């Protein structure tokens, strides 16, 4: 029994190694400490100082450099006793200060223990190296075990959720959030892995469920500067079960796919995996039928300078992808078509618009153009017209307009983006019919999306994501405001103002004003931003109009202020595509293409704007969550460099500050963070009472009784005692 076998990998890899002695005595030392900053500029930095003097209301401790210093007892970051270094739940700590929190996580991570609980959260820190804790053998261990009965692990949370589902007959959720490269997607896959094993029917459906992923990963993931396999879309996966607890189906909901990546990537980044998969792995035959060449031959793939990922065979991955397409069930038919779309996109990208005779766009070469048409199975002359000579309504008048180079290009870009996003939608719908169950009994849904985004530049997509995050954070706080209550002040009240600033109807918030502006064809970024400032500058406490910038505005989010830039918002909100282009493509010969333009469910939004659609999909998701028993996983990146063995304090604390763990902590820290079992308190603290005593509670008053700790510091409740913050350490800080 791996859990009892101190030699198993379970022990090696998931527990703090245990010695031969369990005695309270080894742990002794008289030397107290505090966490201080040897330089206050940079506050996430701390060193341990041995407190050598105590004023009546402050301490005076000894720097690592030997110099003594003074401190207020109330500003003191007390270091928990060493016995606590490495505990499995931060809730077990006496001193719940941030450095204290950072220290426990670091001590663990130093042992390659990447998972740790903090109350209701599972904290997961990317090790940036492979740890073999996801084997079937590791799966097996988690089966039916309580949270408290096994080491922290994604497997654990998953079991607890599945058991809760069976036991309470209630749907569940796991919300997996954090920065890019934190391991959200990785962990998401382990949840499904685990579920598939503990509950699959020893299989077709399960294989399909599993193969859908790689499918969506090829089309929605890409190499970026923070992650070789970045998810450029958010997702909510519903794992469906029958009443007996068996997997009966699945559904995927996708959000905010980064369509622009198809047309542009920053230096070092790559376009979506698939482009490269197609090009590297296509038979030397399709290459031709598709008019393929190499990546360098394509504007959409030859700009970033990076066309490869180390440790990655685009060719092999392509094998993998088509393989998944087969399992799920896409006909070879379907598959050439997908491939063609892809090919087409690439061609559309190579079309060069020139300066003809005056001011209007022309096409000297038609090569790329016909390559494009060919593959899509559209009429090249139509396309051509549709691209440079779109007919535009101007009254009762329908007039062709000759676009200049630029405009033509952008329009071109719009087509590619529509093609891409639509195809993605279609992929998702298709997968769903195969997987999805009408008649499901229960479900476990997993949300894999980013946490708050504060980048160098924040645009419309950032506001969207941050908006979702305000809602999830308030959902958390609201949840915690119940869980905490039912031991045996609702802070979510707190996010309302920001939320309203974004989504409010009357008075209107940012999105409503954006929608309003969107009706006017001649509106501009300036008109827009000016409208925003008119309604909210010095008028809404969560808004800030900048001192000098004329194109940005600030929103005070849960995680702090985020400055956004307004450019292109109107256009992003409308996500326009010339009608002629729709017409052209409404006629494709190709069977798939036609669905993309012919199916209102794919080809359109309602027509609502992009904002209105985001808001509504967010509200549905939240409604879904609202009916589940939720579980929270906070994935942390250890540094910004993708390196193992480098847990950067500032990097870490920041995330803890923004993803709500620190708030969670400091909340309960105002109450009774510790609430130990009676028997449990007695066994290590007996040292009137001996270890395994049966009048537990009594044995528990007893110890507090000898030591005669202050009563308001502790509280007698059935089964457990609670200890206000710091009580434990001092209790722990006392002679035998
Ligand atoms: Mg991901």
Swiss-Prot record:
Keyword Iron listed: no
Annotated keywords: Actin-binding, ATP-binding, Calmodulin-binding, Coiled coil, Cytoplasm, Methylation, Motor protein, Myosin, Nucleotide-binding, Phosphoprotein
Annotated transmembrane regions: none
Region spans: Actin-binding: 618-640, 715-729
Span of domain Myosin motor: 85-736
A GO biological process held by the record: substrate-dependent cell migration, cell extension
GO terms for cellular component: actomyosin; actomyosin contractile ring; apical cortex; cell cortex; cell trailing edge; cleavage furrow; cortical actin cytoskeleton; cytoplasm
Main subcellular location of this protein, as a coarse class: cytoplasm
Amino acids binding ATP: 178-185
A GO molecular-function descriptor: cytoskeletal motor activity
Signal sequence range: none
Domain called Myosin N-terminal SH3-like: residue spans: 29-81
Location of the protein in the cell: Cytoplasm, Cell cortex
Top-level taxonomic group: Eukaryota
Residues recorded with modification N6,N6-dimethyllysine: 129
Post-translational modification: Phosphorylation inhibits thick filament formation and reduces the actin-activated ATPase activity.
Family membership: Belongs to the TRAFAC class myosin-kinesin ATPase superfamily. Myosin family.
Note: Dictyostelium myosin-2 has no K(2)EDTA ATPase activity, perhaps correlated with the absence of a Cys at the SH-1 position (688).
Subunit details: Myosin-2 heavy chain is two-headed. It self-assembles into filaments. Hexamer of 2 heavy chain subunits (MHC), 2 alkali light chain subunits (MLC) and 2 regulatory light chain subunits (MLC-2). Associates with elmoA.
Entry remark concerning the domains of this protein: Limited proteolysis of myosin heavy chain produces 1 light meromyosin (LMM) and 1 heavy meromyosin (HMM). HMM can be further cleaved into 2 globular subfragments (S1) and 1 rod-shaped subfragment (S2).
Annotated function: Myosin is a protein that binds to actin and has ATPase activity that is activated by actin.
Name of the featured protein: Myosin-2 heavy chain
Parent sequence residues shown: 2 to 759 of 2116
């Amino acid at each position: 029994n791996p859990i009892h076998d101190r030699t198993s990998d379970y022990h090696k890899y998931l527990k703090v190694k245990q010695g031969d002695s369990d005695l309270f005595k080894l742990t002794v030392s008289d030397k107290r400490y505090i966490w201080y900053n040897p330089d206050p500029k940079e506050r996430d930095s701390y060193e341990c100082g041995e407190i050598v003097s105590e004023t009546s209301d402050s301490f005076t401790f000894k720097t690592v450099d030997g110099q003594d210093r003074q401190v207020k007892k109330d500003d003191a970051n007390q270091r928990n006793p060493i016995k606590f270094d490495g505990v499995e739940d931060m809730s077990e700590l006496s001193y719940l200060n941030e450095p204290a929190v950072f220290h426990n996580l670091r001590v663990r991570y130093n042992q390659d223990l990447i998972y740790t609980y903090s109350g209701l959260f599972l904290v997961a820190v990317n090790p940036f190296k492979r740890i073999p804790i996801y084997t079937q053998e590791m799966v097996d261990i988690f089966k039916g075990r309580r949270r408290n009965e096994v080491a922290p692990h994604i497997f654990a949370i998953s079991d607890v959720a599945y058991r809760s589902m069976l036991d309470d007959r209630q749907n569940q959720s796991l919300l997996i959030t954090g920065e890019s490269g934190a391991g959200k997607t990785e962990n998401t896959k382990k949840v499904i892995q685990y579920l598939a094993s503990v509950a699959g029917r020893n299989g077709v459906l399960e294989q399909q469920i599993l193969q859908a992923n790689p499918i969506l990963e090829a089309f929605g993931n890409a190499k970026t500067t923070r992650n070789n396999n970045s998810s450029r879309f958010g997702k909510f996966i519903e794992i469906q079960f029958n009443n007996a607890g068996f997997i009966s189906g699945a559904s995927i909901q996708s959000y905010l796919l980064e369509k622009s990546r198809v047309v542009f990537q920053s230096e070092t980044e790559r376009n979506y995996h698939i482009f490269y998969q197609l090009l590297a792995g296509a038979t030397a035959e399709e290459k031709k039928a598709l008019h393929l060449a190499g990546p360098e031959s394509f504007n959409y793939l030859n700009q970033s300078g990076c066309v490869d990922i180390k440790g990655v065979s685009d060719s092999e991955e392509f094998k993998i992808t088509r393989q998944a397409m087969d399992i799920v069930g896409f006909s070879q038919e379907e598959q050439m078509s997908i491939f063609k779309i892809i090919a087409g996109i690439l061609h559309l990208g190579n079309i060069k618009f020139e300066k003809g005779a005056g001011e209007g766009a022309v096409l000297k070469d038609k090569t790329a153009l016909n390559a494009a048409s060919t593959v899509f199975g559209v009429n090249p002359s139509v396309l051509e017209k549709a691209l440079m000579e779109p007919r535009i309504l101007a009254g009762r008048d329908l007039v062709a307009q000759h676009l200049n180079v630029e405009k033509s290009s952008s329009s071109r870009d719009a087509l590619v983006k529509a093609l891409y996003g639509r195809l993605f939608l279609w992929l998702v719908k298709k997968i769903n019919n195969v997987l999805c169950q009408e008649r499901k009994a229960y479900f476990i849904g997993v949300l894999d999306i980013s946490g708050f985004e504060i980048f160098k530049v924040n645009s419309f997509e950032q506001l969207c994501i941050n908006y979702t995050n305000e809602k999830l954070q308030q959902f958390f706080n609201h949840h915690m405001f119940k869980l905490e209550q039912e031991e045996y002040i609702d802070f979510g009240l707190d996010s309302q103002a920001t939320i309203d600033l974004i989504d409010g109807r009357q008075p209107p918030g940012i999105l409503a004003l954006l929608d309003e502006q969107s009706v006017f064809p001649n509106a501009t970024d300036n008109t827009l931003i000016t409208k925003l400032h008119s309604h909210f500058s010095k008028k809404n406490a969560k808004y800030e109009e900048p001192r000098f910038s004329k194109t940005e505005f600030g929103v005070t989010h849960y995680a702090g202020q985020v400055m956004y830039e307004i450019q292109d918002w109107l256009e992003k909100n409308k996500d326009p595509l010339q009608q002629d282009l729709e017409l052209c493509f409404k006629d494709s010969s190709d069977n798939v293409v036609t669905k993309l333009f012919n199916d209102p469910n794919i080809a359109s939004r309602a027509f609502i704007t992009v904002a209105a659609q985001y808001k509504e999909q967010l509200a549905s998701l939240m409604a879904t969550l609202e009916t589940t028993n939720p579980h929270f996983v906070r994935c942390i990146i250890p540094n910004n460099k993708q390196l193992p063995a480098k847990l950067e304090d500032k990097v870490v604390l920041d995330q803890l500050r923004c993803n709500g763990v620190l708030e969670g902590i400091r909340i309960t820290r105002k109450g009774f963070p510790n609430r130990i079992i009676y028997a449990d308190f007695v066994k290590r603290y007996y040292l009137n009472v001996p270890r395994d005593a049966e009048d537990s509670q009594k044995a528990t008053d007893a110890v507090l009784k000898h030591l005669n700790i202050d009563p308001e510091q502790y509280r007698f409740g059935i089964t457990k005692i609670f200890f206000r913050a710091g009580q434990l350490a001092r209790i722990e800080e006392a002679r035998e």
